[PDB]
Design a protein around this ligand. Structure first.
Ligand SMILES: Nc1ncnc2c1ncn2[C@@H]1O[C@H](COP(=O)(O)OP(=O)(O)O)[C@@H](O)[C@H]1O
Ligand SMILES: Nc1ncnc2c1ncn2[C@@H]1O[C@H](COP(=O)(O)OP(=O)(O)O)[C@@H](O)[C@H]1O
Ligand code: SF4
Ligand code: ALF
Ligand code: ALF
Ligand SMILES: [Mg+2]
Ligand SMILES: [Mg+2]
Lengths: 243, 420, 243, 421
C-alpha cells in the first residue's frame, strides 16, 4: 500500500507497509542497473497508493516521490530505535553519520569525504578474495591485528598485497582491516557529537566483527537493527504513508 | 576568422576543437534551456558562444598596436596598473578537467585542479588566451601556485609578486613596495609611463567594473531572488576575460532589468525556496557543477564568498591626486581581500556572517577544490563558528571531473531537505 | 633448464628455457598467496638448474636469485624487441615505464605513485561488474565515451556508480574508462623521454581497446609481445641462464 | 612509576600513551639493537630511545619548576639561540607516527601532510609528554598546512607565529630580521630574561656547538667504506631536537672520535661496493625510520640527508657579533641560509645536492617527500630534471607514516639499486 524503494549502489531494497501497519521487505543486488532492480522489486507488488524512492537510483526511476537516503535512514531507524539519536549507515560506497530528533527528523549529518569512498565495497571484495573460511567470532581476540592504512581503499589494498605477499596470515589481515575501519568509523561517528549510544545500520553493519570493534573503539553501546539492509527503505515507506 | 587567428597563435587546433566540442551541449542544458532567465543574459550567452573569438581578436589587435597582454591568476594582481597603460589584464585560472592530465606531466597529481588545468592549457597550447598573452603575473599565495610558477616560467615569462602572509603594518609596507616594483615592471614592458591621468583612468575603469558587479550582487538580496545564482557566477567568471568598459555596461544593463523584476516582486523561484550562500575557493569558467546541482535541486544561490564572486568586487580603490598615493591606495584595496592564505583570516568569517544576514541565507555551502589546503584547513574553524551561531553548514569538495554528480547531489539535497 | 618465476600481485607466471633456447610458460592466478602459486607452478616441471624469482612474492619464495620485476621486464622485452628503447608494463597493482639501452640494460625507470596504484585490478573488477556482453569491437566505435576521473580508482569508482545510476550506457562508461586509462598511461609513458617506439606489455596489454586507445594517444608505433603476461618471467629465465 | 607519575602530572592520557609506546622496543630491537657493527658510542642514544619520555621530560619539568620555559617548535628557522640564551628550553615536535594521525584528522583534512596531522594528534590526544610539558608553540608561516594548522592548534596551547618571507632578496632579509627581533622580545617577555651580549653569545655558542658536532659527524660519512649506517645518524639527528644541547654535542663528538678510529683502519659498516645513497627532501621525524631501514636492509648505505633532520639543520652556524643587535641580525641570517622548498626560487638546495653527491661519493639520489607535501612535491620536478641533465641517478619516492607499503617501496628502491650496481 505504501512503498519505499532504496536503490543503492550495491543493493536495492523495497519495503511495503500494508493497511494494518505491518510491512514486508525484499532485497536484490543492484547490478549497476537501478531501473531494472526497482522494476523487479516492484514486480507483483499490488496496488500502491504512495511511493518514495531513495538512493543513487532515485535520480533515474521515473515515478515516486524522491527523498535522500539521509532523510529516509533517519526516519526508518527512528521507527525501530526512537530512543537513540545517532545513526551510522555503512553502505557499499558511502558512510553516513546522522543525528535525528525525537520525531526522527535530521538535525545534522555527515557523509564520507571523496578519499573515503567505497569502504563497504572494498570490504566485500577483499573478503571474497582472501576468503573468510573462518568464522567472525575469531577475529575479535586476534593477537596480531596488523594496522592497515586508513587513508583510502587504494592505500589499504597496496598494504594488503604486500602483507600477504610476505606471508602475513589471512586472518591477521582480515582482523587488521576491520580494526582500522572500525577506528576510522568510530572517529567519523563522533563528528556530530559524542553519542551516548549508536545505531549501526546498512549492509556494512552485517559484519559482526566490525560492530564489535566499533563498539570497543567508541566506548558506548552499538545497536544493530534486526535487518540493517532495509532500514532506509522502511523510512522511505513511512514517508510515503505520511505523504 | 577564428580558425586563422588560432593558427597564428600556434593553438593546437585538434586538441582545442576536442576541448570545446562538448561545451555547447553543456551550456544548452545548464543555461539556455533554463527558463525565466533575464533578457540581458543574451550578451553573456553570446560571449560563451564565441568564447575564443571576438575577445581574443581584440587582444591580438592590441598587441599589433604595441600594447601587451598580461595573464593573472589572483585578484591581488593590480588590474588598475595594467589597464592604465592601455594593455589588457586577463585572468586565466583553470576550470577544465580536459587539461588536467597534461598539467600532471610536470605537477603532482595531489594538487589543486585549478593549477593543474591552467598548466595543462599552456603546455598543450589549447587556450587562445594563454597563447596570446605576453606575460604571466604570478603571486606567492598557495604552495602549488608558488612552486608552479617556477615551472611555468619555462613556457612563458612569469613575474612573481611576493604577497605576504599577515596584514600587520610591516606586511602592508612590504606589499606597497611590491606594488611599486610591479608598476615599474609594467612601465618597462609596455614603454608607457604611469602618470596621474592614466593611473586615475585605470583605477576608474576597474572601479566601474567592480561597482557593476557589486550592484548585481546587491540585487540578489531580494525575495524572490530575481536571478539564478548560476547566471551570476557566469558573469563573475567572464569579468576576468571581457573588455572592462563593455562588460560593465552590459552588467549594468542587466541590473536595470533586475530592478524592474524586483519592483514587481518577480523572481526565478518561489519565496519558500532555500537561499544558499557559497563560500570557499573560486570557481573559474566552466566549473558550473556546484551551482547547477544546488539550483537544480530547487535551491537558489544568492551569493558567492569567493574570488569569482564577492571577494573580487567588494572593495574599490580610493582616489588620490598623485601616482604615489594611487599606488598606495591600489595596494590597500587588494589587501582588503580576506584570502585563506593570510593568517589569521578572521575577516573572512566576519564577511560570511554579514552576507548570511544581508542575503537572508537559509544555509551555507562551503565548497573548496580538492587539495586546496588553505581553504580546506580553514573550513574547520569556519564550520565551527557557523555551527555555534546555528547557521546550517555543508562542507563540499570536488575537482573538475564532472561525473561525481550522484555523490554531490545526495549531500546537497539532504542538506536542502534538512533546512526546509 | 633455466627458470624464471614472476610472483606478481595478480598472476604468477613461469617460463622454462631449455638448452635449445626454446621456451614454455605457465600462468596461474596468485590469489594473494604467491608461495602457493609458485609451488603449484614448479611442480612436475622437471629439475631446474638455475632459478630467478621476481615480483611481490620474490622474498617469501626462499629459492633462487631474487631480481626486481623492473630488471626482469627489461631483459625479456629486450629479447623480443632489441630496437625499442622504452617499455610500459601494466600489471594488476603497479604501472612501470622503463628505458633500456641497446644492450638491454635499464638506464632509467619510473613506477606509479601511491594514488595511481591498482589501475589494472580495478579494470578487471569493473569489467566483471559491468560484464561485457558488449564485444571489444565496439569500444573503438564509441562516439560518446564519457571521460572518467584519472586521479585514482576510488574517484573513478564513484563516477562509475553515478553514471550508471543515472542511465549512462555501460558501453559509454567502459569506453570512457579505457580512454581515460590510455590518456594517463600515455603521458606516464613519456616521463622518461618521449619514445619514438613503445613496447606495451603486462596483463594490461591484453585488453584490445587499451592497446588501440594507447597507440592513438602516444601518436607513435606501439608493439605488443606475443604473450605480454610472461615477458617479465622470460626476462627472469634469461637472467637465470646468464647467471 | 617515577615516569608514570610525571606523566600523570602532565595530564598525559596514560592509556593511549602506553598503547602508543608498546610497539616501539621491538622495532628498535629489530632496526637498531640487533643490527651488527654499530659503533659503541651509539649506546648513549640507544639509552635515550629506551627511555624516550623519561630523563629528558623530567629535566624539562624541573626547568619549569625553576621559572624557565619550554618552547615547542616545528621548523629549523625558529632561532634556538634566542630561547637558549635565557636558560629556557627549545624542543622540536614534528610528528613521525601513524598512531596520532586519526586524532589529528578530527580537526584537519585527511589529505594533508602526515607530519602535521601526527603532531596535531599527539597534542589533541594528550599522548606526548614533551608536548604536554611545553609552555608555548612557535609556529612559522612555511607550508599551507602548517600555517593554517597553527590557527587550530592555538586552541590547545598558545601559538606564536613567526612570518617567514617567501623570497631571499634584500627586502626579505630585512623583513626576517625584524621578525627575529619581534621574536626576541616575545621570549624576553615570557621568560622575564632580558637578553644581553653575555647570555646571547652564550646561547649562540651552545647551539653552534651542537650544530658543529653534527657537521663533524656528517663529514665523516664521506669515507669509503662508510664507517656508520645512515639509519643510526638519522636517529642522532632526530634526537638533536629533544636532547640537552651540551650533553648531546658531547656525545656526538664522542661518537665521531670512535668513527675516526674506524676510518683510520679502513673499517666500515658495509662493503666497498655497496650502493652509496643520498636522501633529499622532507625531514623524517622520529620514529619515521622506514626509508632508511629499507635502503640499508637492501644492501645500500645512506651517506647523507639533504633534509631539515639532516644537513639543512646543521650546515650553517651563526657568525659572531659584538653586541645584541648584531647577534640578532646574525641569527636571522643563519636561518635564512636554509634552502627550504617554501622559498622561490630555491636554487641553493640544488647546489647543495650536487655538492653532496660529489663530496660523499654518491651513486644514487633518492628524493623522498611525505604524501601531500606540496612544496617538496612540486619542486621535485625541477630537481630530478637537473639531476637527469647531470647523469646523476635519481629516484623519487613518496609515502606516509603507514608502515605496510614495504613491498611497494622495496621493489622501487631495489630496482634503483640494481640499476646503479
Ligand atoms: N554477506 C555479505 N555479502 C555482501 N555484502 C555484505 C555482506 N555482509 C556485509 N556486507 C556489506 O554490505 C554492503 C552493502 O550494503 P548496503 O547498505 O546494501 O549498500 P548500499 O545501500 O550502498 O547499496 C557491502 O558493500 C558489504 O560491505
Ligand atoms: N581476460 C583477463 N582477465 C583478467 N585480467 C586481464 C584480462 N585481460 C587483461 N587483464 C589485465 O591484466 C592484469 C594482470 O596483469 P599481470 O601483468 O598478470 O599482473 P601482475 O604482474 O601485477 O600480477 C589485470 O589486473 C587486468 O587489468
Ligand atoms: S588514491 Fe586515495 S588518497 Fe589518493 S586521491 Fe584517491 S582516495 Fe585520495
Ligand atoms: F547506495 Al550506498 F552506501 F553506496 F548506500
Ligand atoms: F605484481 Al604487478 F603490476 F602488481 F606486476
Ligand atoms: Mg544505502
Ligand atoms: Mg607484473
Amino acid at each position: 500500500m505504501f512503498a519505499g524503494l532504496d536503490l543503492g549502489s550495491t543493493n536495492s531494497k523495497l519495503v511495503i507497509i500494508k493497511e494494518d501497519g505491518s510491512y514486508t521487505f525484499k532485497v536484490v543486488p543492484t547490478r549497476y542497473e537501478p531501473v531494472k532492480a526497482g522494476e523487479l522489486l516492484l514486480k507483483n507488488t499490488g496496488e500502491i497508493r504512495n511511493l518514495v524512492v531513495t538512493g543513487y537510483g532515485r535520480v533515474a526511476f521515473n515515478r515516486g516521490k524522491v527523498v535522500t537516503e539521509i532523510t529516509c535512514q533517519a526516519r526508518g531507524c527512528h521507527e525501530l530505535f526512537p530512543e537513540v539519536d545517532y545513526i551510522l549507515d555503512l553502505g557499499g560506497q558511502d558512510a553516513k553519520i546522522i543525528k535525528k530528533d525525537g520525531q526522527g527528523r535530521v538535525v545534522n549529518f555527515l557523509m564520507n569525504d571523496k578519499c573515503a569512498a567505497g569502504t563497504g565495497r572494498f570490504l566485500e571484495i577483499i573478503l571474497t578474495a582472501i576468503g573468510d573460511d573462518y568464522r567472525d567470532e575469531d577475529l575479535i581476540n586476534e593477537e596480531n591485528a596488523v594496522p592497515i592504512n586508513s587513508m583510502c581503499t587504494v592505500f589499504a589494498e597496496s598494504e594488503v598485497i604486500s602483507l600477504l605477499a610476505r606471508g602475513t596470515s589471512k586472518r591477521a589481515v582480515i582482523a587488521g582491516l576491520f580494526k582500522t575501519t572500525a577506528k576510522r568509523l568510530a572517529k567519523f561517528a563522533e563528528s556530530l557529537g559524542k553519542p551516548r549510544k549508536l545505531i549501526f545500520t546498512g549492509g556494512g553493519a552485517k559484519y559482526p566483527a566490525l560492530r564489535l570493534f566499533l563498539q570497543k573503539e567508541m566506548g558506548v553501546e552499538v545497536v544493530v537493527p534486526p535487518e540493517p539492509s532495509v532500514t532506509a527503505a522502511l523510512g522511505a515507506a513511512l514517508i510515503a504513508r505520511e505523504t | 576568422d577564428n580558425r586563422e587567428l588560432w593558427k597564428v597563435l600556434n593553438v593546437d587546433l585538434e586538441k582545442h576543437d576536442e576541448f570545446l566540442a562538448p561545451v555547447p551541449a553543456v551550456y544548452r542544458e545548464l543555461f539556455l534551456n533554463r527558463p525565466n532567465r533575464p533578457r540581458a543574459m543574451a550578451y553573456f550567452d553570446a560571449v560563451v558562444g564565441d568564447i575564443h573569438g571576438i575577445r581574443v581578436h581584440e587582444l591580438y589587435n592590441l598587441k599589433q598596436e604595441g600594447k601587451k597582454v598580461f595573464a593573472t591568476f589572483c585578484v591581488y594582481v593590480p588590474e588598475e596598473i595594467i589597464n592604465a597603460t592601455g594593455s589588457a589584464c586577463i585572468g586565466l585560472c583553470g576550470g577544465a578537467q580536459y587539461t588536467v592530465p597534461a598539467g600532471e606531466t610536470v605537477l603532482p597529481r595531489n594538487l589543486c585542479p585549478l593549477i593543474k588545468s591552467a598548466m595543462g592549457f599552456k603546455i598543450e597550447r589549447i587556450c587562445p588566451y594563454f597563447q596570446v598573452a605576453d606575460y604571466v603575473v604570478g603571486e606567492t599565495t598557495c604552495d602549488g601556485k608558488k612552486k608552479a610558477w617556477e615551472i611555468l616560467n619555462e613556457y612563458i615569462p612569469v613575474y612573481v609578486m611576493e604577497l605576504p602572509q599577515k596584514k600587520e603594518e610591516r606586511d602592508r609596507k612590504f606589499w606597497e613596495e611590491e606594488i611599486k616594483d610591479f608598476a615599474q615592471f609594467v612601465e618597462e614592458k609596455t614603454g608607457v609611463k604611469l602618470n596621474a591621468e592614466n593611473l586615475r583612468a585605470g583605477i576608474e575603469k576597474i572601479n566601474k567594473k567592480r561597482k557593476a558587479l557589486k550592484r548585481l550582487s546587491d540585487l540578489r538580496k531580494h525575495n524572490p531572488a530575481p536571478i539564478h545564482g548560476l547566471d551570476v557566477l557566469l558573469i563573475n567568471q567572464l569579468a576576468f576575460f571581457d573588455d572592462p568598459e563593455r562588460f560593465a555596461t552590459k552588467v549594468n544593463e542587466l541590473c536595470d532589468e533586475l530592478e524592474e523584476r524586483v519592483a514587481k516582486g518577480e523572481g526565478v523561484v518561489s519565496k519558500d525556496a532555500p537561499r544558499i550562500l557559497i563560500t570557499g575557493t573560486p570557481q573559474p569558467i566552466p566549473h558550473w557543477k556546484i551551482h547547477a546541482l544546488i539550483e537544480g535541486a530547487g535551491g537558489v544561490v544568492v551569493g558567492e564568498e569567493t574570488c569569482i564572486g564577492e571577494r573580487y568586487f567588494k572593495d574599490l580603490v580610493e582616489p588620490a591626486a598623485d601616482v604615489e598615493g594611487m599606488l598606495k591606495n591600489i595596494a590597500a584595496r587588494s589587501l582588503k581581500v580576506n584570502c585563506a592564505c593570510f593568517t589569521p583570516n578572521t575577516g573572512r568569517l566576519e564577511d560570511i556572517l554579514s552576507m548570511v544576514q544581508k542575503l537572508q541565507v537559509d544555509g551555507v555551502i562551503h565548497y573548496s577544490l580538492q587539495f586546496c589546503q588553505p581553504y580546506g584547513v580553514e573550513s574547520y574553524l569556519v564550520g565551527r563558528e557557523l555551527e555555534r551561531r546555528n547557521i546550517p553548514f555543508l562542507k563540499l569538495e570536488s575537482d573538475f571531473s564532472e561525473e561525481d554528480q550522484g555523490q554531490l547531489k545526495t549531500r546537497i539535497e539532504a542538506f536542502l531537505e534538512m533546512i526546509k
